[PDB]
Amino acid sequence: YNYRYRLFRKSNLKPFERDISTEIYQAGSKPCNGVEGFNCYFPLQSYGF
Amino acid sequence: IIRGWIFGTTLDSKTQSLLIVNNATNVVIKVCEFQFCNDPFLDVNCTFEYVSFKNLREFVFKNIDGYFKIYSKHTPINLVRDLPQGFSALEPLVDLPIGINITRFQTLLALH
Ligand SMILES: *[C@@H]1O[C@H](CO)[C@@H](O[C@@H]2O[C@H](CO)[C@@H](O)[C@H](O)[C@H]2NC(C)=O)[C@H](O)[C@H]1NC(C)=O
Ligand SMILES: *[C@@H]1O[C@H](CO)[C@@H](O)[C@H](O)[C@H]1NC(C)=O
Ligand SMILES: *[C@@H]1O[C@H](CO)[C@@H](O)[C@H](O)[C@H]1NC(C)=O
């Protein structure tokens, strides 16, 4: 699980753009304020290698 | 007394942010992910780092495909108040592969 892929919401990369966490770019409509339930936490995962 | 610039989106610098600093001996450049100050300082955690009035210094900044290009010119001048009436063309300094989103910026000056 040390190998990761980032997101699935609104804005998407320019060529050779890199993207990093600092605020929760959440996974739906509502603000989360650190919640990880519905609409919430980063859309960030790991591979089951 | 003017010495550099900060660029990025949030400018909290936890979020990645380009920093450019002249320190008279060198130009120093970084993309840092360390929380910067509320107000910049020049009293008399980064993914990339690099090191190199009667006058006017000019710079053009543009960011394309994660390449941050810089062009410049230096000249003498005889009016301090307004930009010079004549024609001159800036030449490329550097073409930096920094890979970051930019929408906001600020300038850095030396302090007593
Ligand atoms: C680059 O940074 C800007 C912020 O300065 C991002 O633009 C905002 O994106 C949100 C959605 O994530 C929109 O609701 C805002 O309206 C946008 N604001 C502006 C000023 O455009 C931009 O999305 C970032 N680039 C990428 C590819 O994520
Ligand atoms: C300028 O920065 C470099 C390291 O980036 C350092 O070696 C040098 O001594 C600095 N000069 C001054 C005057 O601070
Ligand atoms: C420090 O920078 C590295 C990448 O250069 C990053 O993985 C780490 O999350 C950063 N630390 C902080 C406090 O943001």
Phi and psi at residue B95, in whole multiples of 5°? -145, 75
Q: Ligand 2: which of B19, B25, B27, B41 to mutate, most ligand atoms within 8 Å of CB?
A: B25
CA separation for the pair B3, B109 (Å, rounded): 5
Pairing of strands B91-96, B67-76: antiparallel
Label each residue of B2-37 as H, E or C.
Answer: EEEEEEECCCCCCCCCEEEEECCCCEEEECCCCCCC
Q: What is the dihedral of CA A11, A13, A19, A21, to 10 degrees?
A: 10
Query: Residue A49 in contact with residue A3, Cβ under 8 Å?
Result: yes
Q: Residues near B105 by Cβ (< 8 Å), separated by ≥ 6? A: B5, B6, B7, B8
Question: What region does A39 belong to: left with phi over 0, alpha with psi -120 to 50, or beta?
Answer: left
CA separation for the pair B12, B10 (Å, rounded): 5
CA separation for the pair B102, B8 (Å, rounded): 4
- Burial of residue B19 (number of CB atoms within 10 Å: 0-12, 13-18, 19+): buried
End-to-end CA distance of chain B, in Å? 10
CA separation for the pair B49, B98 (Å, rounded): 10
The ligand with the least distance to the CA atom of B47 is: 3
Handedness of CA A34, A39, A44, A45 (dihedral sign): positive
Pairwise CB contact (< 8 Å): B16 & A16: no
Q: What is the strand order of the sheet B67-76 is part of?
A: B55-64, B67-76, B91-96
Q: Which two tokens stand for residue A45?
A: 């995962």
